[PDB]
C-alpha cells in the first residue's frame, strides 16, 4: 500500500425497478484515511439520477483509514477483500449490497452490485431529498472470524431534519490475517453534485480509527 | 387470462457475493390458483446450486390465486405488473428481490433480479438445510394506492426445526385498477430436487385468496 | 373446562411514562372461541384514557379458540399459563407485555402487566386515532419447548389506513403436554367504547385454529 | 449543579415474568461525566439474581456528562427529566424502560420501571453469561422537539464472544431549553459484583460528549 493510491468503480445496481450503472475515478491516501472520488451514474433508461445518490456513497474501502501502527489493520494486511452491507431505512426502504476490491499496483478496482427495495416512492430517496450523511462512528467487532461494522447512520434532509439507516457490514478477507480487537471508525463522507441531475458527483471520506 | 396458462423465467441473481442465473418453465391454472414449473440454475462459477433454493422459490405471480368471483382481482385487472419484496431473515441474512410479470398470449414473461447478503456462511441458507416454506397467510393490505403483503414466513429445516423470514411486498401495476379490502392469501408451496445439487428443481404452489 | 366460563382481570401498565391500571369481568365459551369482556381503565393520574385501548386489548387466552377436536391444543392441556408479547409498531413505538393466566372452578383469571414506550406523541396510539384491530392470522409454531405465536398486525385507523405492528408471542406451560403441529389461529377482536374517554369499554373475540 | 452529587434509585421490574425490585446509591461528578453506585437487587421470590444485571446497568443519566463548555447542554439545562428506552436483543429477547430523574438540593432521585420479554431461557440474559457494555458512541440526534439516542451496543459474553443490542432512547425534558446539533456521547461503564449472586453490585460510568 502507498502512500498515494489511484482507484477505479464501476457499479451494477437497481433500485424500486430502476436498472443503472456506475463509473468512477479518485485518489486517496490510504495512511492518512482519506480519499476522493468522481462518480457518474448512468440510468438503464437514460436519465437524470432517479434516487439520491446518498444511498450508494458509502457502498464506494476501509484500507483508506487511518490506523494506530501499533493496531491490526485487518484492511492493510489484507492487501484481496470482499464487502457485503445491508441497508435497512426507517420507512421501508432496504437495499442490499456487495462488492469486491481488487488491488494491481497503485490502482484500488472496486466492482460492486447494489439492489435497493421498498423505498417510498415520494420518500427522502426516491424524491432526492436527501443532503449526505451525518459523521459517524461505525462500531466494529470480530464475529466467527470476520469483522463486522455496525452503525445506526442519519441521512440529512433538505430542510434540515433525517432519515435514519442501520448498516450492518461483514468484511471479508480473502485469506487469514491477525484480528484488531473491537474498535471504532470515525468518518466523515462528503458529497458534492457537479450537474443539476447529481448523475456527475463527486464524493470525499475522511477515516480514523480509534482504539476503544 | 386463460384457464391454462404457460410460464418462462429468467433471474439473475447474487448470494453472498456468488453470481448465478436461473431458467424455468412451467404451466398454471390461474383461476384454479396452481401452477407448476421446472428451474435450472446455472451458478457463474459452474457448479452445484450454492445455496437453498427455498430462498428463491417465492421470487418465482398473484395471478395464480384462487379469488372469489366477486373481489376485486388486483392481479387478474392488471393483466403488466412489478413486484418488490424484502426477505428479512432471523439470522441476519437479508434478501432482496424484485420483478416483472408481462403476459404474451398464454405466456408469462417472468423477469428477476435477486440479491442476498450477510447469510451466516454456516446457517440453512448457505448449508442448503431447508426444506421448503411452511403453508403460510399473507395478509394483503393497501397502502398508499399499492397492495401490500406482509407475511412471517417459515422456512423448515431438515431436521425439524425452523428458519423465520418476514416477507414484506409491494405489487404496483403499470395502471390503475379497482382496489382490493384487506384480505388474505393462503399459499401451499412445494420443492422438488430434480438432481442432487439441486440445480434442477420443480416448484408447485397452490393458493386461495379469503374474505376475511 | 366448561362449556361457559367465566372471567376477571387486573393490569398494571405504564406507556410514554403514563402510569394506569385495568379491571374486567367477561363470560367465554372455550370450545365455540368466544368471549366478551367489559373494561374500566384508571389513569393513575385520574382522567380519560391516555391512549388507544387497542394496544391494550390483545393481551386481555388461547382457551377461547376452537380446536378440532383431534388436534393437539396446547392450551386446553395446560388447564395455568404464563404469556409474553413483543409489540412492534411501525412507528417506533414498542411495548412489551407479560401475563398469567390462572383457573378457579369457571373463573379464569388473568393478571398483566404491560409497557411501553417511545410511542409517537403525536401518533395513532397517543393521539387515539385507531378503531381496532384487522382480522389476522396467527401462526403457531413450536421453538425450543414451547408455543411461539407471530403475527404481522394491523391497527385500523380512524379515516381508513392502517398502522402495523408485528406481535411476538411465547406460551408458556407450567407442566409438559402434547406439542401441536406448526398451525395458525383466525382472530376477530372488536372493541366497542362504552364511554367518551373510553375508559369503560367493551372486547369482543372469535378465534378458530386451522389444521394446515 | 454541583460539581459533586449524590444519587438514588429505586427500580419496578420484571423480566422474563420474574418481578425485583432495585435499590442503589451513589456519587458523581457531573462537570467530570464521572458516577459510581452501589446497588442492591431483591427477587420478588427472594433468591439471587435471575438474569445479567448488564440489562439493567444503563436505565441507572445524560446529566453526568462532559460536555465542551459551549456546547448546549441539554441535560445540564433541564436541572427534571423523562427517559425512555427501548432494547432489541439480538435473540429475541426485548426490553422496554422508562424512568425519571428529579433533583433534591445535591441529590438526584431515580426512578425506574423495567419490563423484558422474550429473552432466551438460556440465552446470555437469563444464563448470566455477560461480562458487561464494550464501550460505545452513542449518536444523540434532535427529532420533533425531543432529543434521541441511538446506539448499536455489544454486550460482552464470558468466553469472549458478543451478544448484540440496539439502543433507542427518548430524552424529555419537563420545559423548554436550548436544543443541541447533534452530537455523539462516548461512554465507558464498568459492573463490579460484590456477592457471588450478583444481588449486590457496583456500577461505574464514564461518559463525555463529541462535537462531531
Same mark, same amino acid.
Given at each position: 500500500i502507498g502512500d498515494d493510491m489511484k482507484m477505479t468503480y464501476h457499479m451494477d445496481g437497481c433500485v424500486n425497478g430502476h436498472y443503472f450503472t456506475v463509473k468512477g475515478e479518485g485518489n486517496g491516501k490510504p495512511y492518512e484515511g482519506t480519499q476522493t472520488s468522481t462518480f457518474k451514474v448512468t440510468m438503464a433508461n437514460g436519465?437524470?439520477? %432517479?434516487?439520491?445518490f446518498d444511498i450508494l456513497s458509502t457502498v464506494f474501502?476501509?484500507?483508506?483509514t487511518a490506523y494506530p501502527?501499533?493496531?491490526?489493520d485487518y484492511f492493510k494486511q489484507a492487501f484481496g477483500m470482499s464487502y457485503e452491507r445491508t441497508f435497512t431505512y426507517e420507512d421501508g426502504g432496504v437495499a442490499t449490497a456487495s462488492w469486491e476490491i481488487s488491488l494491481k499496483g497503485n490502482c484500488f478496482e472496486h466492482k460492486s452490485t447494489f439492489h435497493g427495495v421498498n423505498?417510498? %416512492?415520494?420518500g427522502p430517496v426516491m424524491a432526492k431529498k436527501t443532503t449526505g450523511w451525518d459523521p459517524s462512528f461505525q462500531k466494529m467487532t470480530v464475529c466467527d472470524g470476520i469483522l463486522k461494522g455496525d452503525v445506526t447512520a442519519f441521512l440529512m434532509l433538505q430542510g434540515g431534519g433525517n432519515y435514519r439507516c442501520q448498516f450492518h457490514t461483514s468484511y471479508k478477507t480473502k485469506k487469514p490475517v491477525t484480528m484488531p480487537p473491537n474498535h471504532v471508525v470515525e468518518h466523515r463522507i462528503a458529497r458534492t453534485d457537479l450537474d443539476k441531475g447529481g448523475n456527475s458527483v463527486q464524493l470525499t471520506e475522511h477515516a480514523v480509527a480509534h482504539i476503544t
Open positions: 436519465g437524470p439520477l %432517479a434516487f439520491s474501502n476501509r484500507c483508506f501502527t501499533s493496531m491490526p423505498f417510498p %416512492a415520494d
